[PDB]
């Protein structure tokens, strides 16, 4: 059984996920729409090619088929839209962290440093909960992103297919979010041991939950599988971040909030600082 | 062959068609699109006319609009109102090039263009219609339909007319015969336009005899005239249903309101009068 401290830790995380994750994407509007290492960027960008479907309240459907790779900026057509979506998702991640009692008690320098290092990873974990592995589509309410064994080569697509195969619960997803958020080895964190103390209790709570709720033989070593996925997500974060910084200086697409996340801390992270001081 | 006067009439009509028909639709711009957000009688008609909008981009991307199943039934009417308006402005310029049309009084020029507006649009639309795929290919824009379709007279017209496989000269002659209809409302010089229409029909009949196999196309001219008569029926059939829709959900552009009668002949068609004098 779970200790009372662990039972209330899970309920606080799940309560935070409910209040901050707009699974229907009803409040996501006002977004843009399409009107050697460079070759590796283009190849991975081609592997991540998706078609955008926008369903309307009346029943109509707008569908956007991306262009084919012919050399030029046409393969970066959906990046401005994806930058508006990532910013909307990250704002929900900010509100998720503010609701957590263990997070708001941290200094404002560590709150910015932690959210800077876990922004991409927290966004990927929420995307996997709406990812359709049967059709290769991210069902984001009114919006859909359908991909166009060789695509599993791209580590970001393989991560979503492998993570979806585990069939995690809501409690396990939100515990992965906490472990990813309270990483003591992020750049800029000062209270290394304090956030390390918090991270271990989330992993201990996750390990206790799985042992008390998943006796099935298909769930053997599930906790260690999850921890191995979090280490893999740390890598893909580095792979995708360096990939986008190379696209940003050639073809600028990042929203003002994304530029701060990529690089006093509160002085060059004004948008994130004001959002941390605001309320629900 | 044809007489020199008939050869000049065809050369003049082909010259007008070339200068005023944008076959690529490259100059069709700034049109409304569906946003991202007898009632049963009319609803059945345009439900049979339900089409999807495809929009090809310069880079190769394709935006496709899927209309909704049965106010949502009139989602593509603002866009079609901008399309019909763009088409008519080319119809006006087509009539202004024909010498037999300028010499008519400005009131009769309005009356003829008012009665032949819908018909000359369908005739030009037919030249870009693909019967195999059921799509009107208007350059970057495509309109694909969504035996059940032949019951609709407007769809049966485009399929039967395309089946005749007319030449460019036969299409523009249909436009002239349709334009110079002597029985349009408000026409005063009916005797002049009747004799003008007869010369176009005689030229069309003579063209078919001289440029087609004699026994195979023995009734091609009479088939064409039957299509024009059928097109007049569809004209009143589509004008009434849109006049009903306009009272419910306004969509017609200012120029369409004058053509339908929404508020002297030139005083009730100020926009159409101005375009004729420019
Ligand atoms: C991967 C699964 C989810 C999506 C479908 C919904 O799949 C795609 C499908 C297609 C495309 C293309 C448009 C083809 C490039 C992109 C993506 N996906 C991203 O482009 C993304 N995913 N995360 N981030 C990101 C987010 C934040 C807060 C951040 O802050 C430091 C940094 C980030 O990247 C370094 C980002 C920017
Ligand atoms: C049939 C071939 C043409 C198109 C595709 C190219 O197919 C459609 C496909 C779908 C739809 C719907 C939006 C579903 C209703 C309409 C249409 N089609 C028209 O909406 C039209 N066709 N002609 N007219 C029109 C034009 C003029 C100058 C006018 O002035 C007196 C009056 C008119 O209507 C009475 C008009 C207004």
């Amino acid at each position: 059984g779970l200790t009372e401290e662990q039972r209330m830790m899970i309920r606080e995380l799940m309560d935070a996920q409910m209040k901050t994750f707009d699974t229907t994407f009803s409040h996501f509007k006002n977004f843009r729409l399409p009107g050697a290492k460079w070759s590796q960027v283009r190849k991975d960008l081609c592997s991540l090619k998706v078609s955008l479907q926008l369903r309307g309240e009346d029943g109509s459907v707008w569908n956007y088929k991306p262009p084919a790779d012919s050399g030029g900026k046409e393969i970066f057509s959906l990046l401005p839209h994806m930058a508006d979506m990532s910013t909307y998702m990250f704002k929900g991640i900010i509100s998720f962290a503010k609701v957590i009692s263990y997070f708001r008690d941290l200094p404002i320098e560590d709150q910015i440093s932690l959210l800077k290092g876990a922004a991409f990873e927290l966004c990927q974990l929420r995307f996997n909960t709406v990812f359709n592995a049967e059709t290769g589509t991210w069902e984001c309410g009114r919006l859909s992103y359908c991909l166009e064994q060789q695509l599993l080569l791209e580590p970001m697509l393989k991560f979503h297919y492998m993570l979806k195969k585990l069939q995690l619960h809501e409690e396990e997803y939100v515990l992965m979010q906490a472990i990813s958020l309270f990483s003591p080895d992020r750049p800029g964190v000062l209270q290394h041991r304090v956030v390390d103390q918090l991270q271990e209790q989330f992993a201990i709570t996750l390990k206790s939950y799985i042992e008390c709720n998943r006796p099935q033989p298909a769930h053997r070593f599930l906790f260690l599988k999850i921890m191995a996925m979090l280490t893999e997500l740390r890598s893909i974060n580095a792979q995708h971040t360096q990939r986008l910084l190379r696209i940003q200086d050639i073809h600028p697409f990042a929203t003002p909030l994304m530029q701060e996340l990529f690089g006093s801390l509160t002085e060059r992270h004004k948008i994130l600082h004001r959002l941390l001081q605001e309320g629900s």
Side-chain angles (χ1 to χ4, degrees), chain A residues 1-28 30-36 38-42 44-56 58-72 74-108 110-133 135-141 143-148 153-192 194-244 246-269 271-273 275-280:
Chain A
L2 291 161
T3 78
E4 205 72 19
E5 312 83 302
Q6 296 166 342
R7 275 180 31 171
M8 302 196 315
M9 185 186 303
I10 292 181
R11 293 205 328 270
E12 191 197 15
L13 297 178
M14 292 263 68
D15 180 69
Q17 181 86 329
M18 169 267 297
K19 297 182 178 183
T20 62
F21 194 0
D22 184 16
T23 65
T24 67
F25 294 73
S26 309
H27 297 100
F28 175 53
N30 290 5
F31 44 79
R32 285 168 290 174
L33 286 174
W38 194 242
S39 298
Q40 186 64 25
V41 169
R42 303 182 112 271
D44 301 331
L45 267 282
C46 290
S47 305
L48 300 171
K49 270 184 59 176
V50 299
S51 68
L52 177 51
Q53 170 160 311
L54 304 95
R55 296 175 293 288
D58 54 72
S60 62
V61 173
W62 269 108
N63 185 271
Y64 172 84
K65 240 61 180 180
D69 187 15
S70 68
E74 89 277 28
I75 49 118
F76 294 142
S77 57
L78 263 179
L79 260 185
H81 174 79
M82 208 60 54
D84 296 333
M85 164 67 83
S86 308
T87 311
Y88 170 82
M89 291 289 293
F90 179 57
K91 279 201 236 294
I93 300 301
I94 301 171
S95 303
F96 172 81
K98 297 195 308 176
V99 176
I100 293 181
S101 61
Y102 314 98
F103 182 85
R104 50 154 164 255
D105 293 358
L106 268 41
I108 207 64
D110 292 349
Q111 294 183 8
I112 296 180
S113 300
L114 286 182
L115 281 166
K116 263 196 60 171
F120 172 87
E121 315 180 7
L122 267 281
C123 283
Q124 292 310 308
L125 297 177
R126 285 190 168 183
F127 277 149
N128 191 255
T129 66
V130 302
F131 176 62
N132 184 305
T135 67
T137 309
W138 287 272
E139 306 177 3
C140 301
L143 299 84
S144 294
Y145 305 87
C146 177
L147 293 159
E148 299 284 62
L153 261 284
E154 168 61 34
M156 218 177 322
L157 295 182
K158 188 174 178 258
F159 173 80
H160 280 283
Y161 276 104
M162 288 174 57
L163 185 58
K164 195 71 179 187
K165 200 115 58 183
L166 308 179
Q167 304 181 102
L168 302 182
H169 294 189
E170 295 288 328
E171 297 82 352
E172 297 160 353
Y173 269 109
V174 76
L175 279 163
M176 295 184 63
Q177 297 181 184
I179 300 174
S180 175
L181 174 59
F182 290 97
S183 299
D185 54 354
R186 299 294 191 189
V189 295
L190 259 290
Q191 299 263 53
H192 277 259
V194 184
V195 302
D196 183 297
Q197 232 167 331
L198 302 176
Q199 188 185 54
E200 184 164 32
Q201 303 310 312
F202 288 122
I204 286 177
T205 302
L206 175 60
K207 178 172 149 65
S208 300
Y209 176 88
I210 299 178
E211 291 173 347
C212 295
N213 292 95
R214 319 204 79 159
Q216 289 76 249
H219 309 340
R220 292 178 69 185
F221 317 107
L222 180 57
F223 169 72
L224 296 183
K225 285 179 183 176
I226 289 175
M227 301 308 298
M229 290 265 76
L230 284 174
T231 311
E232 170 72 357
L233 188 53
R234 290 274 301 245
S235 173
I236 291 151
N237 186 12
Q239 298 184 20
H240 195 63
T241 295
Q242 303 306 124
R243 174 187 303 145
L244 295 199
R246 295 193 288 279
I247 309 172
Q248 169 68 15
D249 62 3
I250 283 189
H251 186 59
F253 65 93
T255 65
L257 182 51
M258 284 181 60
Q259 319 191 26
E260 300 183 343
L261 301 174
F262 293 160
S264 40
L265 274 177
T266 76
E267 219 160 0
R268 34 193 164 90
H269 297 91
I271 312 297
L272 179 51
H273 183 212
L275 289 170
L276 281 174
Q277 287 183 338
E278 289 180 355
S280 304

